[PDB]
Scaffold this active site. Sequence first.
Site, PDB file in Angstrom:
ATOM      1  N   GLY A  62      37.931  38.447  35.426  1.00  0.00           N
ATOM      2  CA  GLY A  62      37.312  37.139  35.234  1.00  0.00           C
ATOM      3  C   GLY A  62      36.970  36.806  33.787  1.00  0.00           C
ATOM      4  O   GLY A  62      36.574  35.676  33.489  1.00  0.00           O
ATOM      5  N   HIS A 101      47.962  31.690  32.921  1.00  0.00           N
ATOM      6  CA  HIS A 101      48.024  32.556  34.086  1.00  0.00           C
ATOM      7  C   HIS A 101      46.973  32.186  35.153  1.00  0.00           C
ATOM      8  O   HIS A 101      47.034  32.739  36.242  1.00  0.00           O
ATOM      9  CB  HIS A 101      47.996  34.059  33.716  1.00  0.00           C
ATOM     10  CG  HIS A 101      46.661  34.610  33.334  1.00  0.00           C
ATOM     11  ND1 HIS A 101      46.481  35.295  32.137  1.00  0.00           N
ATOM     12  CD2 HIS A 101      45.505  34.661  34.038  1.00  0.00           C
ATOM     13  CE1 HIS A 101      45.214  35.687  32.133  1.00  0.00           C
ATOM     14  NE2 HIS A 101      44.590  35.344  33.260  1.00  0.00           N
ATOM     15  N   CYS A 121      39.161  36.514  31.361  1.00  0.00           N
ATOM     16  CA  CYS A 121      40.225  35.713  30.734  1.00  0.00           C
ATOM     17  C   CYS A 121      39.741  34.304  30.357  1.00  0.00           C
ATOM     18  O   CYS A 121      38.911  33.718  31.062  1.00  0.00           O
ATOM     19  CB  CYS A 121      41.478  35.681  31.607  1.00  0.00           C
ATOM     20  SG  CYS A 121      42.128  37.324  32.003  1.00  0.00           S
TER      21      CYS A 121
HETATM   22  O1  LIG Z   1      40.874  39.414  34.866  1.00  0.00           O
HETATM   23  C1  LIG Z   1      41.654  40.176  34.294  1.00  0.00           C
HETATM   24  N1  LIG Z   1      42.976  40.018  34.365  1.00  0.00           N
HETATM   25  C2  LIG Z   1      43.585  38.948  35.144  1.00  0.00           C
HETATM   26  C3  LIG Z   1      44.904  38.514  34.540  1.00  0.00           C
HETATM   27  N2  LIG Z   1      45.954  39.484  34.807  1.00  0.00           N
HETATM   28  C4  LIG Z   1      47.127  39.573  34.076  1.00  0.00           C
HETATM   29  C5  LIG Z   1      47.343  38.752  32.968  1.00  0.00           C
HETATM   30  C6  LIG Z   1      48.502  38.890  32.219  1.00  0.00           C
HETATM   31  C7  LIG Z   1      49.452  39.833  32.568  1.00  0.00           C
HETATM   32  C8  LIG Z   1      49.251  40.634  33.678  1.00  0.00           C
HETATM   33  C9  LIG Z   1      48.096  40.507  34.437  1.00  0.00           C
HETATM   34  C10 LIG Z   1      41.165  41.360  33.530  1.00  0.00           C
HETATM   35  C11 LIG Z   1      41.079  41.288  32.173  1.00  0.00           C
HETATM   36  C12 LIG Z   1      40.541  42.346  31.372  1.00  0.00           C
HETATM   37  O2  LIG Z   1      40.593  42.365  30.138  1.00  0.00           O
HETATM   38  N3  LIG Z   1      40.044  43.425  32.059  1.00  0.00           N
HETATM   39  C13 LIG Z   1      40.103  43.570  33.443  1.00  0.00           C
HETATM   40  C14 LIG Z   1      39.585  44.707  34.061  1.00  0.00           C
HETATM   41  C15 LIG Z   1      39.664  44.836  35.439  1.00  0.00           C
HETATM   42  C16 LIG Z   1      40.264  43.854  36.205  1.00  0.00           C
HETATM   43  C17 LIG Z   1      40.786  42.716  35.606  1.00  0.00           C
HETATM   44  C18 LIG Z   1      40.693  42.552  34.221  1.00  0.00           C
END
Ligand SMILES: O=C(NCCNc1ccccc1)c1cc(=O)[nH]c2ccccc12
EC number: 3.4.19.12
Lengths: 304, 304
Positions: free
Chosen positions: A143, A41, A145
């Site tokens: 961030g 992703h 991921c």
């Molecule tokens: O960076 C994150 N996500 C990006 C990928 N976003 C995605 C990935 C797969 C399916 C749908 C959307 C993210 C990770 C996490 O565990 N906590 C968060 C808390 C607040 C903001 C973002 C996050």
Amino acid sequence: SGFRKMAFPSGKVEGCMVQVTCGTTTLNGLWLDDVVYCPRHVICTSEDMLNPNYEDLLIRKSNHNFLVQAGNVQLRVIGHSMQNCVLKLKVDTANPKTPKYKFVRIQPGQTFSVLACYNGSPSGVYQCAMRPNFTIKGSFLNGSCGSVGFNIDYDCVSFCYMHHMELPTGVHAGTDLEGNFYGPFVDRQTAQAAGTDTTITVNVLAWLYAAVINGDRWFLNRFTTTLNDFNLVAMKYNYEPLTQDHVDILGPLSAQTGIAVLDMCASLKELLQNGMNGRTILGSALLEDEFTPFDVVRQCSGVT
Amino acid sequence: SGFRKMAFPSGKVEGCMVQVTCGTTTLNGLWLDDVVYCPRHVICTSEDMLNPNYEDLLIRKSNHNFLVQAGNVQLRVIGHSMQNCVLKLKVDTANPKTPKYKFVRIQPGQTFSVLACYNGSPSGVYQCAMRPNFTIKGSFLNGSCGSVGFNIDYDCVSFCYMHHMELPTGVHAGTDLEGNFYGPFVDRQTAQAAGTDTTITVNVLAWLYAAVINGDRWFLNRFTTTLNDFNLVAMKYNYEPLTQDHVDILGPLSAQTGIAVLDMCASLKELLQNGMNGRTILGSALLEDEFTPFDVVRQCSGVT
Ligand SMILES: O=C(NCCNc1ccccc1)c1cc(=O)[nH]c2ccccc12
Ligand SMILES: O=C(NCCNc1ccccc1)c1cc(=O)[nH]c2ccccc12
């Protein structure tokens, strides 16, 4: 003595963390030998995550679009491939800090340490259990991921998890290092049901044996039970059914304390039916299920 | 989202761990620059610990009696000195893995990570708070002495604790890196009173703000209180009195959530007077005090 939610020392894993950027999205990658692993992703924009066509999106990307940086060092990307939900970026340099490692797919109920990272930099380490419903109750922000889960046996790092997403419910989903999601999750910004979770019974019993070894003994009683009787109680309280395989794995803790597994099941039965009555066990006011029988022995014996 | 008892990444500290042996006793040492730091009780035998005369015991020791090994590498000892309860072994080689570091004496209520070690090898990492009574509720077995506590700010390791002993009560005591014990403890095998402990009020409020940031909001109420009224309650429940300094440090979390500090004190007052009623906050069934306001912001903002 004392009992803590102890993580493995993260050193061997810190040496593998890199930052991967594609377009405007940045996340963490894992640099082992001449390959960098990261969630696929990374190639999506905010608009793409509704229903990404990953094959189509990756076709627009060239080796030069994947920017890989290890601290202050830029890696040259000579190849890219998608395997399930992970991207594998071949780099021209083997990571000099690559420890002895394996990629493993852990079973639900097993534990591991997570080294939470941002921009390729490690921020913290914590111990997790893979829930029976294949989620992890992590602590991850934007961030995070590409952060990975692992276990370490002497000098060997078994990588078992890579973080991909947070569900609306605030729990986390990810893949093994071959990019296969644990559970039914898809890397798409959609509503996704995490199944009914259960308490990991063998781990709670293992934690009760740790409590006994450490002196917290008040929950011990004059009763015993059978697997059948105990599982009627486990079903009522959404605990995993106990099997003879679980009893066998609890053998060493049974031998250490001289408390037969079924007798410890009877203490657990009484704690489920009567609660803790405002008391604590190992500093906790609920029944802990994130320590496996192996973690208990390791923490109580001192394996390095 | 999610909230964990997160430790710092232990990498920079793993690179400093060494094994020190003197006679038949082996424990951990900390190799920084050309000096190895370890508990002075490494020079005692089992018989000596009743009331050791450390000055006399060290006089029988020569540089060649202190065996220092970093993994598979033997260090040459060219000097030895005792400073308070630590020994400083000058070695002929600077540790190539010495990170930027400081020695700090933490205040009670502050937190830090412990890298538990045996035979100079790291076994696990966990986050601790220095109790108001200057003990730490660690997890340490035989051979864990010399394991250190620390905090990391970007690339700088502030070493704040070195483990020396376990009290009969199963709690742990140790020194700062200049060998000064935290609390009234002496490195002698004698009965030693650890004072009355208290709950770290500012940390529990900080943890309540973390709960709110993460969505656990059920404890919020329509009430407010004053510092005076709140401290009458804190006294009754053995919580540390809240000061304006504590209110000030809670300022950022107050601003983040828009919940005034005294209003959050009123939720804490009600939780102390009524308990949790079988509910949980951040997966805990008791009030957690091992997260400082700084740890909460760091975990909820993502500082690496
Ligand atoms: O960076 C994150 N996500 C990006 C990928 N976003 C995605 C990935 C797969 C399916 C749908 C959307 C993210 C990770 C996490 O565990 N906590 C968060 C808390 C607040 C903001 C973002 C996050
Ligand atoms: O190695 C330990 N102690 C040696 C120094 N023993 C001493 C040091 C100072 C004063 C009196 C005695 C030790 C540490 C610990 O935290 N947990 C333990 C659990 C079981 C067995 C030993 C230990």
